[PDB]
From a paper:
However, the EagR1 homologue [name] from [name] crystallized in isolation and in the presence of the N-terminus of the class I prePAAR effector Rhs1 (Rhs1NT), allowing us to determine apo and effector-bound structures to resolutions of 1.75 Å and 1.90 Å, respectively. A comparison of the chaperone structures in their apo and effector-bound states shows that upon effector binding, both chaperones ‘grip’ the prePAAR-TMD region of their cognate effector in a claw-like manner.
Numbering used by the authors:
A (entry chain B): 1 to 146
B (entry chain A): -4 to 145
Write the structure that this text describes.
């Protein structure tokens, strides 16, 4: 009933019954207003919900909650390079925060049954080659557990 | 290079990846624990940096000041040393116990801070609907002692 949970700093036990609402956040501190930021978040699939339907649901939420949200592209995505790589989808989108036009990539994967793992890159400027390389190397370098 | 870089491996429950050195980790772990009470118990793990000339007790002092602003009827009930892990890798820190009113409901809060990663602070914050008694303190401090630093 106790099972291990790992963070960067070490590891501890949690009851099997827990729900993980952790959000990993990585920023270039002091230069947030020009630099991309990275985010990893977690979610659970609704009954009979597959990953495409999950992404549709999230797209509709962002249309609802964010400023003038617009999806720019949608394509397959992969986290890792081995036979155990996560196979999922990604979108690119923009939305408005005050004067700023925020640019985002988000990639969703079912890492274990019923549980979605979401990688997000957020930039205060349109994507450039540097941001694209960051995004693609981040996903390719991911090493799934187990 | 092929054997490593100034960039740093980073681990989450679901796997690991390389985090470029320029990034600061501001992750917030949130775990909703099992419970049938009106409010669920939860564990929060956050990361912080000490301000210039701020030690760990002073850091705790700063977090209490922020609690008073955001949480209804916040009262500190206890303050004591804390230990995360055991053996040579054990982390010596500090902790508080406190109460506040989440809604119309009284809940019970622990916060324990440590210097796990050199030059950073790791903060465990427990929110529970169940009052702290000797048994609860035992189970909490025993759980802290079981932490295995990386």
């Amino acid at each position: 009933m106790d099972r291990p949970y790992r963070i960067q700093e070490g590891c501890f036990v949690l009851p099997e019954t827990f729900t993980d609402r952790s959000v990993n956040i990585f920023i270039l501190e002091g230069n947030e207003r020009t630099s991309p930021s990275l985010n990893i978040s977690r979610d659970t699939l609704k009954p009979d919900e597959d990953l495409p339907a999950y992404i549709d649901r999230q797209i509709a939420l962002m249309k609802k909650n964010l400023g003038q949200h617009r999806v720019l592209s949608r394509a397959p995505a992969q986290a890792g390079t081995g036979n155990d790589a996560l196979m999922g989808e990604q979108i690119a989108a923009t939305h408005k925060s005050g004067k700023t036009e925020v640019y985002q990539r988000q990639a969703g994967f079912i890492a274990t049954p019923g549980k979605v793992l979401v990688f997000t890159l957020t930039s205060p400027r349109p994507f450039d080659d540097k941001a694209d390389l960051l995004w693609n190397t981040w996903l390719a370098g991911f090493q799934p557990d187990k």
